[PDB]
Amino acid sequence: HKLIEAVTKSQLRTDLPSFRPGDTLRVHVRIIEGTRERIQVFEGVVIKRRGGGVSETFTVRKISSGVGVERTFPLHTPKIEKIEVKRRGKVRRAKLYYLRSLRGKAARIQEI
Amino acid sequence: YRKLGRTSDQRKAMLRDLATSLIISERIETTEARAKEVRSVVEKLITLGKKGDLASRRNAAKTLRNVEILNEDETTQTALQKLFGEIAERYTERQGGYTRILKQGPRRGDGAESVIIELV
């Protein structure tokens, strides 16, 4: 009954900080396409965590030039070099979908 | 889970009524599908009664009906009190399986399978 876990255990990462929805993360994402491999930081608030094991994902949202952007990552993807927990948010639900229609001050998340 | 030919609210109410009736009378005759559904309800209630804490009692109060039971001699108690009193003590050392279903056969009016479900 634990075959899936047994064969996907080697895929899991152990260098991952603890975080919950509402936290502000700095995600250091590897970019390999082009002529060189480099690192682009994506900073935003975690609006979603879902799944379990190797299939777990999380979603981060930021505003770039006034346009909302969301990146969803597999939690254990090798493409992520590291994650910093920059801020800890005070929120009341697991999914922060209500942020999607909020802008500016109304979209602010109180820190802990 | 079975729908029992009823809407969700009606089914929930019927299951509460059947569970309280079973707790009170300790042995009831119903149809096969209703009994197979209510065994789970009644046994989870008995689990709460064995737990015994205040939160368990209130969770049990979410499901039980407000019925009164006249005991041996003009002394009253509620179905919730019986569930957390005599019934819970009866099954302290039994790990699940507090009910049993005995089939009786079809009944005249509609050919439905009548069964007895009783506390063990």
Partner: protein
């Protein structure tokens, strides 16, 4: 929507070939006449 021709006696009985009931699944009561299998006596 409606039968074009009436159904003969032969065709009707052919169709009723499978229209029947079966003997109940019944067992002798070792101590308590006969009973349905996996049912209690409920009268003995």
């Amino acid at each position: 929507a409606v039968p074009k021709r009436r159904t003969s006696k032969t065709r009707k009985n052919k169709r009723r070939t499978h229209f029947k009931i079966s003997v109940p699944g019944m067992t002798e009561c070792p101590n308590c006449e006969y009973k349905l299998s996996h049912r209690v006596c409920k009268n003995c």
